[PDB]
Each structure stands twice: as structure tokens, then as C-alpha cells.
A paper describes a structure:
Structural alignment among N128A, N128D, and WT_VO4 revealed that N128 participated in forming the conformation of the D-loop. The negative charge from D128 in the N128D mutant induced charge repulsion against D57, which resulted in unclear electron density in the conformation of the D-loop and slightly shifted the N-loop. These results clearly indicated that the N128-D57 interaction anchored the D-loop and stabilized the conformation of the active site. N128A and N128D increased the KM more than 30 times, but the kcat values were different. N128D decreased the kcat by 16 times, while the kcat of N128A only decreased 2.5 times. Disruption of the DPN–triloop interaction by N128A and N128D critically decrease the catalytic efficiency by 100–500 times because it induces conformation changes in the D-loop and perturbs the conformation of the P-loop. In the N128D structure, the charge repulsion induces D57 to be unable to interact with S93 and substrate, which decreases the kcat.
Numbering used by the authors: -1 to 54, 61 to 155
The structure:
Amino acid sequence: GPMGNGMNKILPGLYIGNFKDARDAEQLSKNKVTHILSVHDSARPMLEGVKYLCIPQNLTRHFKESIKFIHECRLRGESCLVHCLAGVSRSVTLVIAYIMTVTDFGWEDALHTVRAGRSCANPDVGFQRQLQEFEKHEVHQYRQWLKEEYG
């Protein structure tokens, strides 16, 4: 459906879901989620036991902090949930940017990867164009930055 069927594993330690999934103690416990990257303010208090990164549209300027947050979680064997309102566009864009940086993928191959786990994934055209620009002008330096910081 238009807001998914629950939070979905994309890669080991990386999940995408909607705002409801991000408050679902049963899903969070089952998927051992200890980090949440929120691209939508549910107006509800943060949960205990979880490290948050909250992003208040230009998402490119948030790629670096988002990738660091996800990557440091995954390198320590923990699990991160990225969510927005529907888990279709905003969170998906951030996760595509991450996949592009830890692989040699362009944005379309990264979107294929997200859709393999979360079939409702569908960034809106504005974010597709930001990801196109990212693929052409910046992902190669992000890839080098990741190697210099984390080996």
C-alpha cells in the first residue's frame, strides 16, 4: 500500500518504515532497532533505548550526516531504522544515498535495492533529480570520504 506493510529490511542493520512503524515497540524489538533516523516529526516524545537523528526540500545537504549516522550504527553491528511519514519518498532518498556511497551503484540501481525490500519505495521527482545530481557530481567524493574515515 501507499505507506507500506511494516518496516522492511533493506540491508543487514538497515530498515525503512513509516511513522507508525517507528513507534511500534513490537517491530522495533523484533528488528533490534537501536538507531532511528527521522525525516518526519510525529510530534510524539522520543522513545527510550534509541539514538535519534532528526532531520527537519533540500535533502542533499543532509546526505553526509545521514550516511555517518547509518554507517557508524552498522559498523558496530546495530540496526538503524530510517523513516518519514509514509516511508516512500524522504527516507527512501536518504537510504538510496547511503547505498550509493557504500557500493558502486548509481541511484537507479540503489532504488532497485530498496524496492527489493520495500516495494512501495518511490522517491518523488524532486528527489530523483537531487539523486541524479549526487550521482554525477558528488558520490565519488563521498565514496572516497567513507574510505578515509572508516577504511
